[PDB]
Design a protein around this ligand. Structure first.
Ligand SMILES: [Zn+2]
Ligand SMILES: [Zn+2]
Lengths: 126, 153, 476, 191
């Protein structure tokens, strides 16, 4: 368990880039004599939030398509690569939207096209 | 089910903080359908008119715009005799402007702004549009008499 | 007043309708305005009735037809009617526009020119009439004097295209000339004006303009259209680089220009040859300043055409050797450094493509890879298993690696296709020197090994050949 | 052989989709109707059994075949299009867009081919649920109008055939107004 796990990030394309970079540069400082948290904190050079529940209780952290948290297991995961929107979505809902648009074109497991709220390029990898 | 989560918040939002001059409830006659009432804007001939609209949510809402028609009749350039509304937000793009970013309340706010600022560029009633464009007083009289005849009690 | 015209049209022609046409004379305008106010099908009925009642054998009717043409042309745009009656009006006018002499249609086209220059054409749906008029002038073998009707069409279109176009109605003008039987010079003038226009437009109004230009280009003018779109986008990139000394806008534009040039090259196996001929650097020995960050993007999207794959890749390869010969000669030599302005080198441009690649260029990356493994495979070392056989191979190869590392940072789906191909050239050969490839592989993995735990099986299935490999290979 | 190949072992082959299609172009370009029927079957099972990207690549390939074209190829491609729309219109519907852009290259196609081509587009257009995408409907009315609006008998026929064929398709009360107006325009043009 103390050995490194299979690890990856959801979030904003502009937010997640540096985390991947920092993980790659620090992963050699992974050590199975510490704890999981005690290694992640000093690898990723950050602390965690302990349940930011009270402040952002009803901030609208939902799909912004169906407006739900918890769509049949699904969590808002896919976001906008934009400072002004940052709007989370679901896989299912954002596919069903983007599949329709005349703007959208599909590569192998990728769909390009416009964020519903701000109309900026957003990418979905199934 | 995306329909369900959307209708849930919006119905609660439209019960507690609807746009001023706008009400919308789950209709008692048609409990799948919704009843909207848009109150006559001041500084327009539609003043002292509450117009009933029927709001049917299509099954693929929010990918599909709501279905909105005036049940209480209105004399308007961009609203026909049957209550049908010419507005881009009520159509799917590329022609229309619908997206799930918007809601029942934003489009009813757009309809409230349309009653205040009729579009002579997109007329359903071309007679009424020519009258609005060239003969403001005749249009204002007819629209105000129309308010008085059907939207009064 | 309308029902009598229906009843005079019911039985017979040129007896009652002509005789009613010499009664009023004053106001067909008000008639058609109240007609569109009441019902459009009644207006269609009257239009059929008037146009049969005013034949073009007689000369009184032609001028009623002219005045109803000016009326319906202005009302179809300025008068906001319903869509169906608009289409029926324009279908009708389009239809009866054959039966004429030359000069009446010439003055109708002069009305169009004089409207479209200054007159804010409120919608622009009347321009659907425009081609049919020019069609009649192409076929009117009644000789004019000012000449043939087609020469009047030449004069009118030259006056139209040389004259100013409004920003919002260059799209409509171009999609319309899609149908006119144009020669070379004509279609050259259409696209000359349309290219002139790009700069005084929103960027988001370039893609569809380029689309209609190219489906039009199939008549005469391909070199011109492409040289134009290359020119314009190259200048944008230079502006953006000097201002950095709108990114995600410019890139999302260039990346849908390229799709549009690609569809056309599938539909036209010649568009490509003119492109290539325009862009081949190795014309004799000479580096061209046609080549650019967009100019190359395009080619690397072309590499996915089976027919061009080869020819394009081999160009780039040969251009890149050429790059390095030029730069080496300069750097060894101050005499040339005094004279020549430091031009960007193909190496640097490709790497800038590679930075720009990130967004939406799924179509470009599959060409990059083909390219880089061609650089390494061709110019890997051999004579030990000097400047000339070494450095522009070293720099070729070492371009290769830089590309494919840089790509492997950002295109997370062509991992296991770099990786698996590296290893594919690693394992079996062990006879050709592969030093460069393991050097690559070291940098690749080192950078993010966590990114090979997304493609891991491809290594562990290459460990099964470790028994058969020479010792330095294995240890290294 | 090809039938049982792609019906049982799709799960192998799903990977190696790309290659199949760089094959399928090579089958149609030759003569020998049995070769060209084999190329058809590649395209058919390719859109039938793979994913959307492949499905999208299928239609795109068919588009190239029609448009760039010579007679055999064209004919084959249209036959396949008809099969694909009757099989899965819904999948085909989102690739309707390249199908519309065919109309920009009607210069190459013979009138028989034209009947099937407008047939395809209209059969796609008048799905009851994708009146939402009446886009193609309006654009096809446009090109009909322009062809009818011609001295040249060669264009007149195209418009005529397209128009009449559309009318038959929409004919399984506003629809009746369209068809009547349509056919009345044809009569006037033809008179
Ligand atoms: Zn956004
Ligand atoms: Zn959702």
């Amino acid at each position: 368990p103390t050995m490194l796990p299979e690890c990856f990030f959801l979030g904003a394309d502009h937010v997640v880039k540096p985390l991947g970079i920092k993980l790659s540069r620090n992963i050699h400082l992974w050590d199975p004599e510490n704890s999981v948290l005690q290694n992640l904190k000093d690898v990723l050079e950050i602390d965690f939030p302990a349940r930011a529940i009270l402040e952002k209780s009803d901030f609208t952290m939902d799909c912004g398509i169906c407006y739900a948290y918890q769509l049949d297991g699904t969590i808002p995961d896919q976001v906008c690569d934009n400072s002004q929107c940052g709007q989370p979505f679901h896989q299912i809902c954002l596919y069903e939207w983007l599949r329709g648009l005349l703007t959208s074109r599909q590569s192998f497991n990728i769909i390009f096209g416009e964020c519903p709220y701000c109309s900026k390029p957003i990418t979905l990898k199934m | 089910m995306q329909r369900a989560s959307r209708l849930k918040r919006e119905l609660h939002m439209l019960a507690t903080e609807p746009p001023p001059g706008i009400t919308c409830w789950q209709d008692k006659d048609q409990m799948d359908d919704l009843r909207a009432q848009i109150l006559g804007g001041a500084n327009t001939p539609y003043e002292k008119g509450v117009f009933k609209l029927e709001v049917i949510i299509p099954e693929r809402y929010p990918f599909e715009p709501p279905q909105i028609r005036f049940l209480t009749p209105i004399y308007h350039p961009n609203i026909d005799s049957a209550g049908r509304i010419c507005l881009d937000v009520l159509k799917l793009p590329p022609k229309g402007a619908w997206r799930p970013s918007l809601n029942i309340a934003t489009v009813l706010t757009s309809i409230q702004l349309l009653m205040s600022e009729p579009n002579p560029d997109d007329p359903l009633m071309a007679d009424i549009s020519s009258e609005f464009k060239y003969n403001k007083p005749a249009f204002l009289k007819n629209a105000r008499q129309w308010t008085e005849k059907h939207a009064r009690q | 007043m309308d029902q009598k015209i229906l009843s005079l049209a019911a039985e017979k022609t040129a007896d009652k309708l002509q005789e009613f046409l010499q009664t009023l004379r004053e106001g067909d305008l008000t008639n058609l305005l109240q007609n569109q106010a009441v019902k459009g099908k009644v207006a269609g009925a009257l239009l059929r009735a008037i146009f049969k009642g005013s034949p073009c054998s007689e000369e009184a009717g032609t001028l009623r037809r002219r005045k109803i043409y000016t009326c319906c042309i202005q009302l179809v745009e300025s008068g906001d009617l319903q869509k169906e009656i608009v289409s029926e009006i324009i279908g009708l006018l389009m239809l009866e526009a054959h039966h004429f002499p030359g000069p009446l249609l010439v003055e109708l086209a002069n009305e169009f020119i004089s409207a479209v220059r200054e007159g804010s054409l409120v919608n622009g749906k009347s321009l659907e009439l425009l081609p049919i008029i020019l069609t009649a002038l192409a076929t009117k073998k009644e000789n004019l004097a000012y000449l043939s009707g087609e020469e009047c069409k030449k004069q009118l279109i030259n006056t139209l295209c040389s004259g100013r176009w409004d920003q919002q109605y260059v799209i409509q003008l171009t999609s319309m000339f899609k149908d006119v039987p144009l020669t070379a010079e004509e279609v050259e003038f259409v696209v000359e004006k349309a290219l002139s226009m790009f700069s005084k437009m929103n960027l988001q109004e370039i893609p569809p303009l380029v689309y209609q230009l190219l489906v039009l280009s199939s008549k005469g003018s391909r070199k011109s259209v492409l040289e134009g779109i290359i020119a314009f986008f190259s200048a944008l990139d230079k502006q953006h680089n000097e201002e950095q000394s709108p990114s995600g806008e410019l890139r999302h534009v260039e990346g849908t220009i390229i799709l549009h040039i690609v569809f056309a090259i599938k539909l036209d196996y010649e568009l490509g040859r003119e492109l290539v001929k325009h862009l081949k650097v190795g014309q004799q020995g000479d580096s061209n300043n046609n080549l650019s960050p967009f100019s190359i993007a395009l080619l690397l999207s072309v590499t996915r055409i089976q027919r061009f794959q080869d020819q394009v890749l081999d160009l780039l390869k040969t251009s890149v050797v050429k790059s390095f010969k030029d730069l080496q000669l300069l750097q060894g030599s101050k005499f040339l450094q005094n004279l020549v302005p430091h031009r960007s080198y193909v190496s640097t441009m490709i790497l800038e493509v590679v930075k720009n690649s990130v967004h939406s260029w799924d179509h470009v990356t599959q060409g990059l890879v083909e390219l880089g493994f061609i650089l390494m495979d061709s110019y890997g070392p051999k004579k030990v298993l000097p400047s000339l056989s070494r450095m522009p191979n070293q720099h070729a190869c070492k371009l290769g690696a830089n590309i494919l590392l840089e790509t492997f940072k950002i295109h997370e789906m062509i991992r296991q296709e770099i990786l698996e191909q590296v290893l594919n050239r690693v394992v079996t050969r062990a006879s050709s020197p592969i030093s460069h490839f393991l050097d690559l592989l070291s940098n690749i993995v080192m950078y993010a090994p966590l990114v090979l735990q997304s493609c891991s099986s491809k290594v562990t299935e290459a460990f099964d050949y470790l028994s058969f490999l020479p010792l330095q290979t294995v240890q290294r | 052989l090809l039938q049982s190949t792609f019906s049982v072992h799709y799960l192998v082959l799903k990977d190696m989709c790309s290659s199949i299609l760089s094959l399928a172009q090579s089958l149609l370009h030759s003569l020998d109707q049995s070769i060209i029927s084999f190329g058809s079957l590649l395209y058919k099972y390719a859109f039938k059994f793979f994913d959307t990207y492949c499905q999208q690549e299928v239609v795109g390939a068919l588009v190239t075949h029609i448009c760039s074209g010579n007679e055999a190829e064209v004919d084959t491609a249209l036959d396949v299009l008809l099969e694909l729309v009757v099989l899965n219109p819904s999948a085909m519907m989102m690739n309707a867009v390249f199908v519309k852009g065919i109309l920009d290259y009607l210069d190459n196609i013979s009138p028989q081919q034209i009947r099937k081509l407008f047939y395809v587009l209209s059969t796609l257009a008048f799905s009851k649920q994708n009146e939402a995408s009446s886009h193609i409907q309006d654009d096809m009315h446009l090109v009909i109008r322009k062809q009818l609006s011609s001295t040249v008998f060669k264009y007149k026929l195209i418009g005529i055939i397209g128009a009449v064929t559309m009318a038959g398709i929409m004919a399984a009360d506003e629809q009746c107004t369209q068809v009547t107006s349509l056919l009345q325009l044809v009569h006037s043009c033809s008179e």
